[PDB]
Design a protein around this ligand. Structure first.
Ligand code: NA
Length: 228
């Protein structure tokens, strides 16, 4: 529980230090979620998954992907932006659109399922700008305190003595751009992959190949994007 336990317990060691400036804020978000339940409102993902993106090592991140907020439909969000459990079908529409761009860009077959944990295990941070949502109500937790947390995460990544490539999908993700100003960081921005915006420039954006080009141009290893 993020109200009750500290970052050293909740997240990976490097992330716990990176998020020190927002330690009180994370506890406050735990208190917000408690109050939602007390009032009879729900949230997604499950409490134990809210900080999941920060359970993969901070020092290993080479690319971050940033979306808006978790999937609104119960049974979809798992704490890793855009990912679903390997037994979910049909895929969420945003994810189907991501995978159509993945095939168009990379030439790979469609993935077997919607589980993006291989990316997380290969140095991709799968972050949402806001880390909870009320069911059925996209953006319902915008402005409730998560933005300071995810801002802190990006600044800390950007401060490391390492290259970083950010892929910012949609308007709320784009508000992290200022924090990526330093010369070791590069940002790719496009419209969000949901059907409401994907046809404004997400399709054809080739983010995966571009990210790898950028990493190689900074002396870093490219991501193996191939999903099984
Ligand atoms: Na999500």
């Amino acid at each position: 529980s993020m109200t009750a336990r500290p970052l050293s317990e909740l997240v990976e060691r490097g992330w716990a230090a990176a998020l020190e400036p927002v330690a009180d804020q994370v506890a406050h978000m735990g208190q917000f979620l408690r109050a939602e339940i007390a009032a009879g409102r729900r949230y997604l993902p499950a409490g134990s998954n809210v900080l999941r993106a920060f359970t993969f090592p901070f020092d290993n991140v080479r690319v971050l992907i940033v979306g808006q907020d978790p999937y609104p439909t119960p049974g979809h969000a798992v704490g890793l932006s855009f990912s679903v459990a390997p037994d979910v079908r049909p895929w969420p529409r945003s994810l189907a659109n991501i995978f159509d761009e993945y095939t168009a860009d990379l030439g790979y077959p469609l993935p077997s399922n919607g589980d993006l944990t291989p990316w997380a295990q290969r140095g991709v941070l799968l972050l949402n700008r806001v880390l909870t949502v009320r069911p059925s109500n996209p953006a319902s937790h915008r402005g409730k305190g998560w933005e300071a947390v995810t801002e802190c995460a990006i600044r800390a990544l950007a401060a490391r003595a390492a290259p970083l490539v950010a892929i910012l999908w949609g308007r709320d993700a784009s508000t992290l751009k200022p924090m990526l100003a330093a010369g070791n960081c590069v940002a790719i921005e496009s419209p969000h992959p949901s059907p409401l915006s994907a046809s404004r420039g997400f399709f054809g954006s080739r983010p995966f190949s571009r990210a790898n080009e950028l990493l190689v141009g900074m002396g870093a290893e490219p991501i193996d994007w191939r999903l099984p």
